[PDB]
Design an enzyme around this catalytic site. Structure first.
Site, PDB file in Angstrom:
ATOM      1  N   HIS A 133       0.804  -1.215   0.000  1.00  0.00           N
ATOM      2  CA  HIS A 133       0.000   0.000   0.000  1.00  0.00           C
ATOM      3  C   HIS A 133       0.840   1.270   0.000  1.00  0.00           C
ATOM      4  O   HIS A 133       0.295   2.351  -0.248  1.00  0.00           O
ATOM      5  CB  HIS A 133      -0.944   0.019   1.205  1.00  0.00           C
ATOM      6  CG  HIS A 133      -2.043  -0.993   1.128  1.00  0.00           C
ATOM      7  ND1 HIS A 133      -2.883  -1.102   0.040  1.00  0.00           N
ATOM      8  CD2 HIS A 133      -2.440  -1.943   2.007  1.00  0.00           C
ATOM      9  CE1 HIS A 133      -3.749  -2.077   0.253  1.00  0.00           C
ATOM     10  NE2 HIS A 133      -3.502  -2.603   1.439  1.00  0.00           N
ATOM     11  N   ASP A 171      -2.963 -10.607  -1.808  1.00  0.00           N
ATOM     12  CA  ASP A 171      -3.519  -9.939  -0.643  1.00  0.00           C
ATOM     13  C   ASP A 171      -4.926  -9.456  -0.975  1.00  0.00           C
ATOM     14  O   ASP A 171      -5.198  -9.019  -2.096  1.00  0.00           O
ATOM     15  CB  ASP A 171      -2.616  -8.768  -0.243  1.00  0.00           C
ATOM     16  CG  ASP A 171      -3.037  -8.107   1.054  1.00  0.00           C
ATOM     17  OD1 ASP A 171      -4.042  -7.363   1.049  1.00  0.00           O
ATOM     18  OD2 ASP A 171      -2.345  -8.317   2.074  1.00  0.00           O
ATOM     19  N   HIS A 173      -6.511  -6.926  -0.318  1.00  0.00           N
ATOM     20  CA  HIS A 173      -6.618  -5.510  -0.632  1.00  0.00           C
ATOM     21  C   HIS A 173      -5.773  -5.175  -1.853  1.00  0.00           C
ATOM     22  O   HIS A 173      -4.694  -5.742  -2.053  1.00  0.00           O
ATOM     23  CB  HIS A 173      -6.186  -4.654   0.559  1.00  0.00           C
ATOM     24  CG  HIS A 173      -6.991  -4.898   1.797  1.00  0.00           C
ATOM     25  ND1 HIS A 173      -6.530  -5.662   2.847  1.00  0.00           N
ATOM     26  CD2 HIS A 173      -8.233  -4.486   2.148  1.00  0.00           C
ATOM     27  CE1 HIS A 173      -7.451  -5.706   3.794  1.00  0.00           C
ATOM     28  NE2 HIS A 173      -8.494  -5.000   3.395  1.00  0.00           N
ATOM     29  N   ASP A 264      -4.852 -12.127   4.139  1.00  0.00           N
ATOM     30  CA  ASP A 264      -6.093 -11.611   4.697  1.00  0.00           C
ATOM     31  C   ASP A 264      -7.312 -11.962   3.854  1.00  0.00           C
ATOM     32  O   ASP A 264      -8.422 -11.544   4.197  1.00  0.00           O
ATOM     33  CB  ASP A 264      -6.016 -10.092   4.894  1.00  0.00           C
ATOM     34  CG  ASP A 264      -5.266  -9.387   3.785  1.00  0.00           C
ATOM     35  OD1 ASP A 264      -5.052  -9.986   2.712  1.00  0.00           O
ATOM     36  OD2 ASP A 264      -4.875  -8.221   3.999  1.00  0.00           O
ATOM     37  N   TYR A 304      -4.119 -11.249   9.130  1.00  0.00           N
ATOM     38  CA  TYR A 304      -4.203 -10.815  10.519  1.00  0.00           C
ATOM     39  C   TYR A 304      -4.862 -11.832  11.443  1.00  0.00           C
ATOM     40  O   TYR A 304      -5.087 -11.525  12.620  1.00  0.00           O
ATOM     41  CB  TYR A 304      -4.931  -9.466  10.589  1.00  0.00           C
ATOM     42  CG  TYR A 304      -4.315  -8.487   9.624  1.00  0.00           C
ATOM     43  CD1 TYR A 304      -3.104  -7.870   9.918  1.00  0.00           C
ATOM     44  CD2 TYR A 304      -4.901  -8.233   8.390  1.00  0.00           C
ATOM     45  CE1 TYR A 304      -2.515  -6.998   9.031  1.00  0.00           C
ATOM     46  CE2 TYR A 304      -4.317  -7.360   7.493  1.00  0.00           C
ATOM     47  CZ  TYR A 304      -3.122  -6.748   7.820  1.00  0.00           C
ATOM     48  OH  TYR A 304      -2.528  -5.879   6.935  1.00  0.00           O
TER      49      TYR A 304
HETATM   50  O1  LIG Z   1     -10.918  -0.455   6.090  1.00  0.00           O
HETATM   51  C1  LIG Z   1     -10.900  -1.690   6.349  1.00  0.00           C
HETATM   52  O2  LIG Z   1     -11.561  -2.494   5.638  1.00  0.00           O
HETATM   53  C2  LIG Z   1     -10.074  -2.218   7.524  1.00  0.00           C
HETATM   54  C3  LIG Z   1      -8.588  -1.885   7.403  1.00  0.00           C
HETATM   55  C4  LIG Z   1      -8.009  -2.254   6.040  1.00  0.00           C
HETATM   56  C5  LIG Z   1      -6.872  -3.258   6.176  1.00  0.00           C
HETATM   57  C6  LIG Z   1      -5.616  -2.803   5.445  1.00  0.00           C
HETATM   58  S1  LIG Z   1      -5.043  -1.249   6.194  1.00  0.00           S
HETATM   59  C7  LIG Z   1      -4.553  -3.894   5.593  1.00  0.00           C
HETATM   60  C8  LIG Z   1      -3.403  -3.728   4.609  1.00  0.00           C
HETATM   61  S2  LIG Z   1      -2.869  -5.344   3.969  1.00  0.00           S
HETATM   62  K   LIG Z   2      -4.303  -7.725  -4.045  1.00  0.00           K
HETATM   63 ZN   LIG Z   3      -4.461  -6.664   2.971  1.00  0.00          ZN
END
Ligand SMILES: O=C(O)CCCC[C@@H](S)CCS
Ligand SMILES: [K+]
Ligand SMILES: [Zn+2]
Ligand SMILES: [K+]
Length: 354
Positions: A133, A171, A173, A264, A304
Protein backbone atom coordinates in the site's frame (compact mmCIF):
# COMPACT_ATOMS: atom_id res chain seq x y z
CA UNK A 1 16.75 -27.52 -5.51
CA UNK A 2 17.22 -25.22 -2.50
CA UNK A 3 14.55 -23.03 -0.91
CA UNK A 4 15.55 -19.87 0.92
CA UNK A 5 13.97 -18.32 3.99
CA UNK A 6 14.61 -15.00 5.70
CA UNK A 7 13.31 -14.07 9.15
CA UNK A 8 14.62 -11.68 11.79
CA UNK A 9 13.36 -11.02 15.31
CA UNK A 10 14.20 -7.31 14.99
CA UNK A 11 11.22 -6.73 12.68
CA UNK A 12 8.97 -7.34 15.70
CA UNK A 13 10.11 -4.06 17.28
CA UNK A 14 7.64 -2.11 15.12
CA UNK A 15 4.63 -1.83 17.41
CA UNK A 16 1.58 0.27 18.28
CA UNK A 17 2.24 1.87 21.66
CA UNK A 18 -1.38 3.06 21.97
CA UNK A 19 -3.25 -0.02 20.68
CA UNK A 20 -1.38 -3.17 21.70
CA UNK A 21 -4.16 -5.30 20.15
CA UNK A 22 -3.85 -3.61 16.75
CA UNK A 23 -4.17 -6.39 14.12
CA UNK A 24 -0.75 -5.71 12.51
CA UNK A 25 0.80 -7.51 15.48
CA UNK A 26 4.55 -8.05 15.96
CA UNK A 27 3.78 -11.75 16.57
CA UNK A 28 2.53 -12.08 12.97
CA UNK A 29 6.01 -13.03 11.76
CA UNK A 30 7.04 -15.12 14.78
CA UNK A 31 3.84 -17.18 14.56
CA UNK A 32 4.55 -17.93 10.89
CA UNK A 33 8.17 -18.68 11.80
CA UNK A 34 7.13 -20.92 14.69
CA UNK A 35 4.71 -22.82 12.44
CA UNK A 36 7.59 -23.52 10.04
CA UNK A 37 9.59 -25.01 12.92
CA UNK A 38 6.89 -27.33 14.30
CA UNK A 39 6.10 -28.52 10.75
CA UNK A 40 9.83 -29.29 10.24
CA UNK A 41 9.94 -26.99 7.21
CA UNK A 42 12.60 -24.66 8.64
CA UNK A 43 15.39 -27.27 8.68
CA UNK A 44 14.76 -28.00 4.98
CA UNK A 45 15.21 -24.33 3.98
CA UNK A 46 18.46 -22.42 3.59
CA UNK A 47 18.48 -19.49 6.01
CA UNK A 48 19.02 -16.17 4.21
CA UNK A 49 20.32 -13.29 6.36
CA UNK A 50 18.34 -10.09 6.83
CA UNK A 51 19.86 -6.66 6.28
CA UNK A 52 18.90 -3.00 6.17
CA UNK A 53 18.00 -1.43 2.86
CA UNK A 54 19.96 1.68 1.96
CA UNK A 55 18.37 5.07 1.41
CA UNK A 56 19.68 4.96 -2.16
CA UNK A 57 17.82 1.67 -2.61
CA UNK A 58 14.66 3.31 -1.25
CA UNK A 59 15.05 6.06 -3.87
CA UNK A 60 14.41 3.42 -6.55
CA UNK A 61 10.68 3.78 -5.80
CA UNK A 62 10.17 6.52 -3.18
CA UNK A 63 10.73 10.26 -3.19
CA UNK A 64 13.50 11.75 -1.06
CA UNK A 65 10.95 13.68 1.02
CA UNK A 66 9.02 10.54 1.98
CA UNK A 67 12.23 8.74 2.96
CA UNK A 68 13.24 11.69 5.14
CA UNK A 69 9.94 11.88 7.06
CA UNK A 70 10.12 8.22 8.02
CA UNK A 71 13.88 8.47 8.72
CA UNK A 72 13.13 11.38 11.07
CA UNK A 73 10.48 9.36 12.91
CA UNK A 74 13.23 7.29 14.59
CA UNK A 75 14.00 10.19 16.98
CA UNK A 76 10.49 11.51 17.66
CA UNK A 77 8.75 11.58 21.03
CA UNK A 78 5.47 9.68 21.58
CA UNK A 79 3.32 12.78 21.03
CA UNK A 80 5.10 13.65 17.78
CA UNK A 81 4.72 10.03 16.65
CA UNK A 82 0.95 9.98 17.18
CA UNK A 83 0.44 13.22 15.24
CA UNK A 84 2.67 12.04 12.39
CA UNK A 85 1.01 8.62 12.22
CA UNK A 86 -2.42 10.25 12.10
CA UNK A 87 -1.37 12.26 9.03
CA UNK A 88 -1.50 9.04 6.96
CA UNK A 89 -4.28 6.61 6.04
CA UNK A 90 -4.17 3.78 8.62
CA UNK A 91 -0.59 4.07 9.88
CA UNK A 92 0.95 3.80 13.35
CA UNK A 93 4.62 4.64 13.94
CA UNK A 94 7.06 3.84 16.74
CA UNK A 95 10.76 4.61 17.16
CA UNK A 96 11.61 1.26 15.52
CA UNK A 97 9.27 1.50 12.51
CA UNK A 98 11.89 2.92 10.14
CA UNK A 99 14.50 0.26 10.98
CA UNK A 100 11.93 -2.55 10.67
CA UNK A 101 10.82 -1.30 7.25
CA UNK A 102 14.49 -1.12 6.22
CA UNK A 103 14.95 -4.70 7.41
CA UNK A 104 11.85 -5.88 5.55
CA UNK A 105 13.10 -4.42 2.26
CA UNK A 106 16.72 -5.50 2.72
CA UNK A 107 15.59 -9.00 3.65
CA UNK A 108 13.88 -9.23 0.25
CA UNK A 109 16.87 -7.79 -1.61
CA UNK A 110 19.08 -10.58 -0.25
CA UNK A 111 16.45 -13.18 -1.18
CA UNK A 112 16.07 -11.91 -4.75
CA UNK A 113 19.86 -11.79 -5.08
CA UNK A 114 20.09 -15.38 -3.84
CA UNK A 115 17.48 -16.40 -6.41
CA UNK A 116 18.98 -14.43 -9.30
CA UNK A 117 22.51 -15.73 -8.66
CA UNK A 118 21.28 -19.32 -8.36
CA UNK A 119 22.13 -19.85 -4.69
CA UNK A 120 18.49 -20.88 -4.17
CA UNK A 121 15.74 -21.74 -6.63
CA UNK A 122 12.98 -19.94 -4.71
CA UNK A 123 12.56 -18.18 -1.38
CA UNK A 124 10.04 -17.03 1.22
CA UNK A 125 10.26 -13.75 3.16
CA UNK A 126 8.54 -13.52 6.56
CA UNK A 127 8.77 -9.75 7.01
CA UNK A 128 6.86 -6.81 8.46
CA UNK A 129 5.58 -4.12 8.19
CA UNK A 130 3.93 -4.87 4.80
CA UNK A 131 4.61 -2.80 1.69
CA UNK A 132 2.06 -3.02 -1.11
CA UNK A 133 0.00 0.00 0.00
CA UNK A 134 2.98 2.36 0.31
CA UNK A 135 3.05 4.99 -2.42
CA UNK A 136 6.03 6.78 -3.95
CA UNK A 137 5.48 9.82 -1.70
CA UNK A 138 3.40 8.61 1.27
CA UNK A 139 2.72 5.74 3.66
CA UNK A 140 -0.60 3.90 3.68
CA UNK A 141 -2.33 0.80 5.00
CA UNK A 142 0.31 -0.25 7.57
CA UNK A 143 2.98 0.11 4.84
CA UNK A 144 5.91 2.54 4.90
CA UNK A 145 7.94 1.46 1.84
CA UNK A 146 6.77 -0.78 -1.00
CA UNK A 147 8.95 -3.82 -0.35
CA UNK A 148 7.77 -5.80 -3.38
CA UNK A 149 8.17 -2.77 -5.66
CA UNK A 150 11.66 -2.04 -4.30
CA UNK A 151 12.70 -5.68 -4.77
CA UNK A 152 11.64 -5.57 -8.43
CA UNK A 153 13.77 -2.46 -9.02
CA UNK A 154 16.63 -4.02 -7.05
CA UNK A 155 16.36 -7.20 -9.14
CA UNK A 156 16.66 -5.12 -12.31
CA UNK A 157 19.63 -3.21 -10.89
CA UNK A 158 21.73 -6.38 -10.42
CA UNK A 159 20.79 -7.88 -13.81
CA UNK A 160 19.52 -5.59 -16.58
CA UNK A 161 17.06 -2.70 -16.59
CA UNK A 162 14.54 -4.60 -18.75
CA UNK A 163 14.43 -7.71 -16.54
CA UNK A 164 10.83 -8.94 -16.70
CA UNK A 165 9.38 -9.15 -13.18
CA UNK A 166 5.86 -10.41 -12.48
CA UNK A 167 4.28 -9.22 -9.23
CA UNK A 168 1.23 -11.24 -8.16
CA UNK A 169 -0.67 -9.56 -5.33
CA UNK A 170 -3.17 -11.99 -3.81
CA UNK A 171 -3.52 -9.94 -0.64
CA UNK A 172 -7.24 -9.26 -0.28
CA UNK A 173 -6.62 -5.51 -0.63
CA UNK A 174 -5.57 -3.83 -3.87
CA UNK A 175 -1.90 -2.91 -3.94
CA UNK A 176 -2.52 0.72 -4.83
CA UNK A 177 1.10 1.67 -4.26
CA UNK A 178 2.42 -1.14 -6.45
CA UNK A 179 0.02 -0.21 -9.25
CA UNK A 180 1.01 3.47 -9.24
CA UNK A 181 4.75 2.76 -9.10
CA UNK A 182 4.69 0.52 -12.19
CA UNK A 183 1.64 2.00 -13.93
CA UNK A 184 3.73 3.26 -16.87
CA UNK A 185 6.19 0.33 -16.83
CA UNK A 186 6.23 -2.57 -19.29
CA UNK A 187 9.09 -4.44 -17.57
CA UNK A 188 7.12 -5.11 -14.35
CA UNK A 189 3.76 -6.84 -14.84
CA UNK A 190 1.39 -6.19 -11.93
CA UNK A 191 -1.48 -8.63 -11.37
CA UNK A 192 -3.67 -8.06 -8.30
CA UNK A 193 -6.69 -9.96 -7.02
CA UNK A 194 -8.66 -8.06 -4.41
CA UNK A 195 -12.04 -7.50 -2.84
CA UNK A 196 -13.48 -4.43 -4.58
CA UNK A 197 -17.21 -3.98 -3.79
CA UNK A 198 -17.49 -1.18 -6.38
CA UNK A 199 -14.82 0.78 -4.51
CA UNK A 200 -16.30 0.41 -1.02
CA UNK A 201 -13.56 -1.91 0.27
CA UNK A 202 -10.21 -0.59 1.47
CA UNK A 203 -8.31 1.24 0.04
CA UNK A 204 -11.63 2.63 -1.29
CA UNK A 205 -10.47 3.75 -4.74
CA UNK A 206 -11.73 3.07 -8.25
CA UNK A 207 -8.09 2.63 -9.30
CA UNK A 208 -8.61 -1.04 -8.34
CA UNK A 209 -11.19 -1.65 -11.08
CA UNK A 210 -10.57 -3.88 -14.09
CA UNK A 211 -10.52 -0.98 -16.57
CA UNK A 212 -7.20 0.33 -15.18
CA UNK A 213 -4.81 -1.47 -17.54
CA UNK A 214 -1.77 0.80 -17.21
CA UNK A 215 -0.71 4.02 -18.88
CA UNK A 216 1.71 4.97 -21.63
CA UNK A 217 4.27 2.23 -22.22
CA UNK A 218 2.60 0.27 -19.40
CA UNK A 219 -0.73 -0.19 -21.19
CA UNK A 220 -1.69 -3.83 -20.67
CA UNK A 221 0.88 -4.47 -17.91
CA UNK A 222 -1.49 -3.75 -15.00
CA UNK A 223 -4.12 -6.46 -14.42
CA UNK A 224 -6.76 -5.83 -11.76
CA UNK A 225 -9.07 -8.70 -10.82
CA UNK A 226 -11.76 -7.10 -8.62
CA UNK A 227 -14.27 -9.16 -6.62
CA UNK A 228 -17.79 -7.87 -6.02
CA UNK A 229 -20.77 -9.31 -4.20
CA UNK A 230 -19.93 -11.74 -1.45
CA UNK A 231 -17.41 -13.97 0.31
CA UNK A 232 -15.00 -15.38 -2.29
CA UNK A 233 -12.99 -18.55 -1.82
CA UNK A 234 -10.88 -21.30 -3.40
CA UNK A 235 -13.03 -21.91 -6.54
CA UNK A 236 -12.93 -18.23 -7.49
CA UNK A 237 -9.16 -17.92 -7.08
CA UNK A 238 -8.66 -21.20 -8.93
CA UNK A 239 -10.70 -19.87 -11.86
CA UNK A 240 -8.98 -16.47 -11.96
CA UNK A 241 -5.57 -18.16 -12.13
CA UNK A 242 -6.71 -20.59 -14.83
CA UNK A 243 -8.49 -17.96 -16.94
CA UNK A 244 -6.41 -14.82 -16.38
CA UNK A 245 -3.31 -14.98 -14.18
CA UNK A 246 -1.57 -18.02 -15.64
CA UNK A 247 -2.27 -17.29 -19.36
CA UNK A 248 -1.14 -13.67 -19.04
CA UNK A 249 1.92 -14.57 -16.95
CA UNK A 250 3.05 -17.26 -19.40
CA UNK A 251 2.83 -14.89 -22.37
CA UNK A 252 4.74 -12.25 -20.41
CA UNK A 253 7.41 -14.93 -19.74
CA UNK A 254 8.79 -13.36 -16.55
CA UNK A 255 12.38 -13.85 -15.47
CA UNK A 256 11.44 -13.33 -11.80
CA UNK A 257 8.17 -13.80 -9.93
CA UNK A 258 7.43 -11.76 -6.80
CA UNK A 259 4.36 -12.72 -4.77
CA UNK A 260 2.89 -9.98 -2.59
CA UNK A 261 1.53 -12.78 -0.43
CA UNK A 262 -0.99 -11.27 1.91
CA UNK A 263 -3.13 -13.81 3.74
CA UNK A 264 -6.09 -11.61 4.70
CA UNK A 265 -8.25 -13.33 2.07
CA UNK A 266 -7.89 -16.49 4.17
CA UNK A 267 -10.71 -18.24 5.99
CA UNK A 268 -10.99 -16.79 9.48
CA UNK A 269 -9.33 -13.44 8.82
CA UNK A 270 -11.02 -10.65 10.83
CA UNK A 271 -10.59 -8.06 8.05
CA UNK A 272 -10.95 -9.74 4.65
CA UNK A 273 -14.22 -11.64 4.86
CA UNK A 274 -13.12 -14.31 2.36
CA UNK A 275 -12.57 -18.08 2.72
CA UNK A 276 -9.39 -19.04 0.86
CA UNK A 277 -8.05 -22.21 2.48
CA UNK A 278 -4.39 -23.12 3.10
CA UNK A 279 -4.70 -25.72 0.34
CA UNK A 280 -5.85 -22.95 -1.99
CA UNK A 281 -2.75 -20.87 -1.31
CA UNK A 282 -0.65 -24.00 -1.86
CA UNK A 283 -2.17 -24.61 -5.31
CA UNK A 284 -1.70 -20.96 -6.27
CA UNK A 285 1.93 -21.17 -5.14
CA UNK A 286 2.41 -24.41 -7.06
CA UNK A 287 1.05 -22.87 -10.27
CA UNK A 288 3.35 -19.84 -10.07
CA UNK A 289 6.37 -22.15 -9.73
CA UNK A 290 5.81 -23.18 -13.36
CA UNK A 291 7.04 -19.68 -14.33
CA UNK A 292 10.48 -18.07 -14.60
CA UNK A 293 12.14 -21.50 -14.25
CA UNK A 294 10.87 -21.63 -10.68
CA UNK A 295 12.40 -18.31 -9.59
CA UNK A 296 9.64 -17.33 -7.15
CA UNK A 297 9.93 -15.04 -4.12
CA UNK A 298 7.04 -15.15 -1.63
CA UNK A 299 6.83 -11.89 0.35
CA UNK A 300 4.54 -11.57 3.36
CA UNK A 301 2.08 -8.68 3.14
CA UNK A 302 -1.24 -8.57 5.01
CA UNK A 303 -3.07 -11.27 6.93
CA UNK A 304 -4.20 -10.81 10.52
CA UNK A 305 -5.49 -14.16 11.83
CA UNK A 306 -2.38 -15.62 13.43
CA UNK A 307 -3.47 -19.24 13.00
CA UNK A 308 -4.70 -18.71 9.43
CA UNK A 309 -1.60 -16.92 8.13
CA UNK A 310 0.71 -19.40 9.88
CA UNK A 311 -0.90 -22.40 8.20
CA UNK A 312 -1.30 -20.61 4.86
CA UNK A 313 2.26 -19.36 4.41
CA UNK A 314 3.72 -22.64 5.68
CA UNK A 315 1.71 -24.38 2.96
CA UNK A 316 3.29 -22.03 0.40
CA UNK A 317 6.79 -22.80 1.70
CA UNK A 318 5.89 -26.50 1.49
CA UNK A 319 5.19 -26.01 -2.22
CA UNK A 320 8.47 -24.16 -2.85
CA UNK A 321 10.29 -27.07 -1.19
CA UNK A 322 8.80 -29.48 -3.74
CA UNK A 323 6.00 -31.16 -1.80
CA UNK A 324 2.92 -32.30 -3.67
CA UNK A 325 -0.13 -30.00 -3.52
CA UNK A 326 -2.77 -31.10 -1.01
CA UNK A 327 -6.20 -31.75 -2.47
CA UNK A 328 -8.85 -29.03 -2.44
CA UNK A 329 -12.40 -29.41 -1.14
CA UNK A 330 -18.26 -25.59 -5.83
CA UNK A 331 -19.82 -23.58 -8.67
CA UNK A 332 -18.45 -20.08 -9.15
CA UNK A 333 -20.67 -17.36 -7.73
CA UNK A 334 -22.31 -15.41 -10.55
CA UNK A 335 -20.56 -12.13 -9.72
CA UNK A 336 -17.18 -13.88 -9.80
CA UNK A 337 -17.81 -15.02 -13.38
CA UNK A 338 -18.85 -11.46 -14.24
CA UNK A 339 -15.60 -10.11 -12.79
CA UNK A 340 -13.42 -12.61 -14.66
CA UNK A 341 -15.27 -11.83 -17.90
CA UNK A 342 -14.67 -8.08 -17.48
CA UNK A 343 -10.92 -8.57 -17.02
CA UNK A 344 -10.78 -10.89 -20.04
CA UNK A 345 -12.42 -8.30 -22.31
CA UNK A 346 -10.30 -5.44 -20.95
CA UNK A 347 -7.01 -7.30 -21.47
CA UNK A 348 -7.67 -9.39 -24.59
CA UNK A 349 -6.36 -6.48 -26.75
CA UNK A 350 -2.94 -6.87 -25.11
CA UNK A 351 -2.67 -10.64 -24.49
CA UNK A 352 -3.44 -12.93 -27.42
CA UNK A 353 -3.51 -15.89 -25.01
CA UNK A 354 -6.85 -14.52 -23.73
O1 LIG B 1 -10.92 -0.46 6.09
C1 LIG B 1 -10.90 -1.69 6.35
O2 LIG B 1 -11.56 -2.49 5.64
C2 LIG B 1 -10.07 -2.22 7.52
C3 LIG B 1 -8.59 -1.89 7.40
C4 LIG B 1 -8.01 -2.25 6.04
C5 LIG B 1 -6.87 -3.26 6.18
C6 LIG B 1 -5.62 -2.80 5.44
S1 LIG B 1 -5.04 -1.25 6.19
C7 LIG B 1 -4.55 -3.89 5.59
C8 LIG B 1 -3.40 -3.73 4.61
S2 LIG B 1 -2.87 -5.34 3.97
K1 LIG C 1 -4.30 -7.72 -4.05
ZN1 LIG D 1 -4.46 -6.66 2.97
K1 LIG E 1 2.95 -2.31 -14.95
Amino acid sequence: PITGLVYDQRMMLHHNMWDSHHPELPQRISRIFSRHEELRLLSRCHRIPARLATEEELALCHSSKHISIIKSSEHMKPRDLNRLGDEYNSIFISNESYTCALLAAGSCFNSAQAILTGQVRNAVAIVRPPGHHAEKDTACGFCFFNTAALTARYAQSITRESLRVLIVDWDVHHGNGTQHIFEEDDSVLYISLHRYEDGAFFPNSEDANYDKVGLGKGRGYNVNIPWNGGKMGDPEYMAAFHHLVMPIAREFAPELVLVSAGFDAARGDPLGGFQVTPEGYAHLTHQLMSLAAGRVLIILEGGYNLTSISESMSMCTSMLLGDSPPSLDTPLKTSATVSINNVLRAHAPFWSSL
